[PDB]
């Protein structure tokens, strides 16, 4: 079947592992445990077609050249994580020597009340790149399916 290489990127503690674990395990992992590099391979049905999903959960260059699609993650209560976004985007495009890389912007921890980044700012930044913006919460599962689904669709469109 068709195989999709997805890479989840973002600053330390934005919820890269929590989002990945909520997606494929259906539970919220409320614990501190920073990542070096974890990967998961699962079969999933997208728009009626079974495909292989490869998800690389990264730490906050060989994975940027391997990946076919990137989930750019920030935390709504972490301003520095939002500022890092344009840097991750620029690194991926430089590594892949391309300005045609499937990407999705993700604003995580939406369930929290202590936001420091206005959602309007994330929507305008995503629109400036021509990429989708999804508000997510790895705790409530809000937008989690939408974020991974939207990115698989973008990789598939690029593959055809």
């Amino acid at each position, epitope marked *: 079947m068709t195989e999709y290489k997805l890479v989840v990127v973002g600053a330390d503690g934005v919820g890269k592992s929590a989002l990945t674990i909520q997606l494929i395990q259906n539970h919220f992992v409320d614990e501190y445990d920073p990542t070096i590099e974890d990967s998961y391979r699962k*079969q*999933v*049905v997208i*728009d*009626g077609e*079974t495909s292989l999903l490869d998800i690389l959960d990264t730490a906050g260059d060989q994975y940027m050249r391997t990946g076919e699609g990137f989930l750019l993650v920030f935390a709504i209560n972490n301003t520095k994580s939002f500022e890092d976004i344009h840097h991750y985007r620029e690194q991926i495009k430089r590594v892949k020597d391309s300005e045609d890389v499937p990407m999705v912007l993700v604003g995580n921890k939406s369930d929290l009340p202590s936001r420091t980044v206005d959602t309007k700012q994330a929507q305008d930044l995503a629109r400036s790149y021509g990429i989708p913006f999804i508000e997510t919460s790895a705790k409530t599962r809000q937008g989690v*399916d939408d974020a*991974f689904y939207t990115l698989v669709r973008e990789i598939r469109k690029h593959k055809e």
Partner: nanobody
Amino acid sequence: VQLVESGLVQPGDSLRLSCAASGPSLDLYGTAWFRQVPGKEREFVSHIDRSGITIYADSVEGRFTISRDSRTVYLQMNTLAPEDTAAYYCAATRSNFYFPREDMSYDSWGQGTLVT
């Protein structure tokens, strides 16, 4: 959508199960077979997606064959062993994003069939 399913057999013998569907937009549905040993967890058996791609559990890989009438899904069971005695269920979903081996992905289910 509504699902309708179609007994005792010797080790090494064959049997066919059928899952008949009825309702709106039957062509958008992917169908899975699950089975359950009494007192145990429900386990994935095989699935045919909306586009016709088949997948199987490693335990039945090559032994069983799922197929579909271009309105019924079939589960062809051959070379049966004691470990295949279970209650068999078909399940279906028109979801555009789901993990096919997870029972929580399916909102429509057959009544079950007992295989010994």
